[PDB]
Amino acid sequence: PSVFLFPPKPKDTLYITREPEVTCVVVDVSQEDPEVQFNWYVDGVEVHNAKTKPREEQFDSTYRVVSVLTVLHQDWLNGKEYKCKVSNKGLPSSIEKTISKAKGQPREPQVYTFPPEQEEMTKNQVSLRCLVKGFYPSDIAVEWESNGQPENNYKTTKPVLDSDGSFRLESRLTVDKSRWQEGNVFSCSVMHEALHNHYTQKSLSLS
């Protein structure tokens, strides 16, 4: 009977028109609905604006209950503590979790792009690489774009810790070789709190 607490999507905290939320999940292998209750707290003060969904059966036959707490962009970025406490109805025993933005001087990402490797120029689909390093905290969003429109066909690694305490990750965008050959510009878009206006972009095209 275990509880998970997830931070907001990094993009949501960095763009004020987005709706960042923290997410509390209860996973339970037992059919018996124990009628879980959530208490939420921001820096130890209970709040009441969480939206909790009904118990649902998962594909693996376990049961999960999801509770979402809307958060203020600055509240997350200023290191406020989000506490999820879970109770079965009228039974005082409880499990809690706490998360918060990691502490430490924010550091700006450095962004590198790489064209496809030439022994890949024999394939129908080629890869573009965006390497991002030197950043703190780990909270970051990496996306791609071309001709002012999003590219969805990318995979991004989990953040890895370098030995100076800053993080790094790599994204790879897979596109049809014809698109790369026709001279289209592909932008790696990087969103991090330590970047000016939380955004920078590096661009890649054939010459």
Side-chain angles (χ1 to χ4, degrees):
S2 65
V3 183
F4 300 97
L5 193 48
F6 297 102
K9 294 175 181 84
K11 195 170 75 188
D12 294 354
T13 70
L14 298 174
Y15 290 70
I16 204 162
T17 76
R18 303 201 117 249
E19 301 165 22
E21 62 195 22
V22 164
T23 313
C24 195
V25 192
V26 190
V27 179
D28 193 342
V29 301
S30 327
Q31 273 190 84
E32 269 219 61
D33 189 349
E35 271 178 303
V36 147
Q37 302 297 317
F38 293 83
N39 291 91
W40 285 98
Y41 315 75
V42 175
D43 282 338
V45 165
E46 184 165 358
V47 294
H48 294 284
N49 56 310
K51 288 144 168 189
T52 299
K53 306 210 203 79
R55 198 152 196 262
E56 61 174 318
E57 186 184 341
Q58 309 272 73
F59 282 128
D60 68 1
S61 85
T62 59
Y63 299 82
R64 80 165 181 180
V65 189
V66 177
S67 193
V68 170
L69 179 73
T70 280
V71 304
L72 290 175
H73 303 241
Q74 268 296 303
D75 273 8
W76 181 261
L77 294 174
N78 298 344
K80 292 224 163 139
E81 282 201 10
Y82 298 85
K83 191 197 250 176
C84 176
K85 158 175 286 118
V86 176
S87 275
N88 307 324
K89 183 182 200 180
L91 297 174
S93 276
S94 79
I95 300 137
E96 61 181 46
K97 296 280 168 144
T98 295
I99 60 172
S100 63
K101 191 187 74 170
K103 281 164 204 201
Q105 190 73 50
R107 324 200 240 157
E108 276 195 40
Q110 300 128 41
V111 189
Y112 302 93
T113 60
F114 305 87
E117 307 186 20
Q118 193 193 8
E119 226 169 17
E120 212 196 14
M121 290 267 61
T122 73
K123 308 271 202 164
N124 293 124
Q125 285 213 299
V126 297
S127 275
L128 309 179
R129 284 167 72 227
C130 194
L131 179 82
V132 187
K133 64 182 280 253
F135 68 91
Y136 198 81
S138 53
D139 313 286
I140 202 166
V142 185
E143 281 176 21
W144 296 78
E145 179 179 61
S146 176
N147 300 314
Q149 231 41 48
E151 298 295 322
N152 303 323
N153 197 26
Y154 65 88
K155 67 193 139 143
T156 311
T157 67
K158 288 171 168 319
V160 170
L161 191 63
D162 278 320
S163 34
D164 85 342
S166 75
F167 295 87
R168 72 173 24 215
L169 54 61
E170 209 175 310
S171 196
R172 303 176 169 72
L173 177 71
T174 303
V175 301
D176 275 9
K177 181 186 168 190
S178 57
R179 312 189 40 210
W180 173 251
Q181 290 298 355
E182 288 151 15
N184 288 110
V185 173
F186 292 91
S187 277
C188 183
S189 293
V190 177
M191 290 158 275
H192 187 92
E193 71 165 284
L195 285 167
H196 173 76
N197 275 169
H198 302 163
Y199 166 95
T200 200
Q201 143 279 325
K202 284 290 181 80
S203 299
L204 204 66
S205 62
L206 189 69
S207 61

